[PDB]
Amino acid sequence: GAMTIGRAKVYATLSKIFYHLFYDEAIPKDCREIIEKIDFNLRSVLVRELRGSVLIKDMPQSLAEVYESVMKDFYERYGFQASELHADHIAVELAFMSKLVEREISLAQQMKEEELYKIRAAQHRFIKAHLQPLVKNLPSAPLLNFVRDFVREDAKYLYSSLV
Q: Site residues (CB under 5 A) for Cl ion?
A: 43-45
At a CB cut-off of 8 Å and minimum separation 6, what does 22 contact?
44, 47, 48, 85, 89, 91
Number of other CB atoms surrounding residue 77 within 10 Å: 9
The sign of the CA dihedral 105, 109, 115, 118 is positive
Shortest Cβ distance from residue 139 to Cl ion (Å)? 14
Q: Which is nearer to Cl ion, 86 or 99 (CB)?
A: 86
CB distance 22 to 85 below 8 Å: yes
Q: Which is nearer to Cl ion, 49 or 76 (CB)?
A: 49
Q: Which is nearer to Cl ion, 18 or 67 (CB)?
A: 18
Shortest Cβ distance from residue 50 to Cl ion (Å)? 13
Alpha-carbon Rg for the chain in angstroms: 15
Q: Which is nearer to Cl ion, 23 or 159 (CB)?
A: 23
Number of other CB atoms surrounding residue 133 within 10 Å: 15
Shortest Cβ distance from residue 114 to Cl ion (Å)? 47
Shortest Cβ distance from residue 49 to Cl ion (Å)? 11
